[PDB]
Design a protein around this ligand. Sequence first.
Ligand SMILES: *[C@@H]1O[C@H](CO[C@H]2O[C@@H](C)[C@@H](O)[C@@H](O)[C@@H]2O)[C@@H](O[C@@H]2O[C@H](CO)[C@@H](O[C@@H]3O[C@H](CO)[C@@H](O)[C@H](O)[C@@H]3O)[C@H](O)[C@H]2NC(C)=O)[C@H](O)[C@H]1NC(C)=O
Ligand SMILES: *[C@@H]1O[C@H](CO)[C@@H](O[C@@H]2O[C@H](CO)[C@@H](O[C@@H]3O[C@H](CO)[C@@H](O)[C@H](O)[C@@H]3O)[C@H](O)[C@H]2NC(C)=O)[C@H](O)[C@H]1NC(C)=O
Ligand SMILES: *[C@@H]1O[C@H](CO)[C@@H](O[C@@H]2O[C@H](CO)[C@@H](O)[C@H](O)[C@H]2NC(C)=O)[C@H](O)[C@H]1NC(C)=O
Ligand SMILES: *[C@@H]1O[C@H](CO)[C@@H](O[C@@H]2O[C@H](CO)[C@@H](O)[C@H](O)[C@H]2NC(C)=O)[C@H](O)[C@H]1NC(C)=O
Length: 306
Amino acid sequence: CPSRCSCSGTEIRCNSKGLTSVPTGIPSSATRLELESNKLQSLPHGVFDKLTQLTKLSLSSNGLSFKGCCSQSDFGTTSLKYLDLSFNGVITMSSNFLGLEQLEHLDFQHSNLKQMSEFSVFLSLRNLIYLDISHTHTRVAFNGIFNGLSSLEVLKMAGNSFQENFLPDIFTELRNLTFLDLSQCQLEQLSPTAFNSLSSLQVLNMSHNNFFSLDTFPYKCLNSLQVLDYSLNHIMTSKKQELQHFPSSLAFLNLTQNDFACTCEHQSFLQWIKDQRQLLVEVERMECATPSDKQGMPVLSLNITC
Ligand SMILES: *[C@@H]1O[C@H](CO[C@H]2O[C@@H](C)[C@@H](O)[C@@H](O)[C@@H]2O)[C@@H](O[C@@H]2O[C@H](CO)[C@@H](O[C@@H]3O[C@H](CO)[C@@H](O)[C@H](O)[C@@H]3O)[C@H](O)[C@H]2NC(C)=O)[C@H](O)[C@H]1NC(C)=O
Ligand SMILES: *[C@@H]1O[C@H](CO)[C@@H](O[C@@H]2O[C@H](CO)[C@@H](O[C@@H]3O[C@H](CO)[C@@H](O)[C@H](O)[C@@H]3O)[C@H](O)[C@H]2NC(C)=O)[C@H](O)[C@H]1NC(C)=O
Ligand SMILES: *[C@@H]1O[C@H](CO)[C@@H](O[C@@H]2O[C@H](CO)[C@@H](O)[C@H](O)[C@H]2NC(C)=O)[C@H](O)[C@H]1NC(C)=O
Ligand SMILES: *[C@@H]1O[C@H](CO)[C@@H](O[C@@H]2O[C@H](CO)[C@@H](O)[C@H](O)[C@H]2NC(C)=O)[C@H](O)[C@H]1NC(C)=O
């Protein structure tokens, strides 16, 4: 077993050891390798060339930058199923996962991704089930960003942003999605058809965007949806005057910490909000932001009159 590592079968873990270099003598038989929470600032060229049996690799939480990710030439193996490069430096995409088509789990969270959003870099990853590109300084504009991800079930993309603060139809190929995190993306508007193909979606996180309205129409097709998180937006009205119901599958609607406008101008919307009581969570944290004389009051404890 390499120095400062723990070995079990073909698995090697060398985590939180303050390592500045990759341990020497890692055997070619290794199938899983974790070097997480260390101080690796660079990897010598072809350091992984002998690790041809690797199915799992995590380099999470180091100071690594990749001038050309990601390919079998970068990691030696062509049988990688799990790659975690989260909490690192700059990751530039020069190769579209050449030789890494077996990937099932991919994590880039809190690393600065470059040359990804303008292209369809995931085109070959027909087996990918989990993708995390949260907080990657990604500006979404090109609609084909996720082309190829037919099998995807979990998509986390929190802490990014969209051209024109607009959510386009970027999920149309992702029919197997069960979890979608779009929180903290500065969103203000969405395509009415953005979620129409997502019949298996169970959790949709829209928390801490910049929406001023809430409607039921974009969620009409979401007949597997259980949790809808709209906390921390600026919701005070709806596009449509006549709001319907959310899908019957829905169990939780989070509207806490929205800047509700408790005025006669929004009597109808607020009445509809009251009627969603059985869906709502922590109702004490649903408070009026305006007008001044009602600021801080729980929305459900108010009867607005004109
Ligand atoms: C927010 O509003 C609700 C409902 O609004 C109704 O309030 C009543 C008083 C009336 O003006 C009506 O036109 C409104 O639509 C308030 O809930 C109601 O509270 C009153 C007073 O406690 C209840 O009245 C009582 O009714 C029973 C018979 O049902 C009588 O025996 C009593 O004498 C008494 O009059 C009424 O039942 C409540 N409504 C129901 C059934 O939930 C609520 O208090 C109010 N909140 C505030 C303070 O803003
Ligand atoms: C708005 O309200 C919803 C519903 O109460 C909150 O959703 C909750 O979010 C947390 C954190 O994501 C979930 O906890 C997670 O649970 C799974 C196990 O199911 C576990 O693997 C994770 O480690 C984590 O603990 C929780 O399940 C979820 N609640 C429900 C009922 O779905 C949400 O946090 C609220 N939003 C904000 C910003 O407060
Ligand atoms: C989407 O998910 C479903 C599972 O709900 C996949 O369908 C299964 O596919 C396997 C073969 O890999 C079959 O053995 C199962 O019988 C299928 N389940 C049923 C009953 O439909 C489907 O392949 C996934 N789609 C993609 C493109 O990955
Ligand atoms: C939606 O995303 C937000 C973050 O954008 C989640 O809220 C955070 O939850 C974690 C627990 O995993 C806490 O450590 C943070 O303090 C929370 N942050 C905020 C914004 O208060 C939220 O849990 C997500 N919702 C769902 C349903 O998963």
